[PDB]
Design a protein around this ligand. Structure first.
Ligand SMILES: Cc1c(O)cccc1C(=O)N[C@@H](CSc1ccccc1)[C@H](O)CN1C[C@H]2CCCC[C@H]2C[C@H]1C(=O)NC(C)(C)C
Lengths: 99, 99
């Protein structure tokens, strides 16, 4: 698909058996989901946004299905107000910016 | 231009006679630049990212050249660690996401 940017680029994701909506976010290095429980061990991480920092849990090698495309990667979980798909996962689904 | 997402999608901008690098940011509704002086009056605005909120100055009808494409729009100025080109200006330069 081509997605124009007149509205937020929200897509449906399936992760750990759950369906969510997530924002395709070229400005995010990382993928950040709201609180959910996930398989494997994790490590603590601080990530900086625009207003300051949040604490997250880093899960590696997590399966995510983004708009019907499977990707495996690092997913951070914590108190973000919107689910964010970052560049780490967009590269895996062949996602480009164009003009 | 096709831009892939293996690295940050940084482009060169010209605004207020100055050259800056800015991130093409599909996850930003608005355009936010580091501290700089700008024409016309402004209004105070609060914007919220990950980590919380920052205070900015909102300037309307500001000319910006993004990767050589002219756009006119709202530019927010304040303590962001990175210049961000948001959707409001991306739409003006014909910028899409694709996969
Ligand atoms: C800049 C901006 C607006 O003008 C309007 C609405 C949101 C935002 C905003 O902060 N957007 C952010 C997503 S986080 C987000 C939060 C709320 C709603 C939607 C997205 C950016 O797209 C990403 N954003 C761009 C940039 C913001 C300035 C500081 C450094 C990066 C931080 C990076 C970021 O947060 N990365 C994470 C891995 C932590 C997710």
């Amino acid at each position: 698909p081509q997605i124009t940017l007149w509205q937020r680029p929200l897509v449906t994701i399936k992760i750990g058996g759950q369906l969510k909506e997530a924002l395709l976010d070229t400005g995010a290095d990382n993928t950040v989901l709201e609180e959910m429980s996930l398989p494997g061990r994790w490590k603590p991480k601080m990530i900086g946004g625009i207003g300051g920092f949040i604490a997250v849990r880093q899960y590696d090698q997590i399966l995510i299905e983004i708009c019907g495309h499977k990707a495996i990667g690092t997913v951070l979980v914590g108190p973000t107000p919107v689910n964010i798909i970052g560049r780490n996962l967009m590269t895996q689904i062949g996602c480009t910016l164009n003009f």
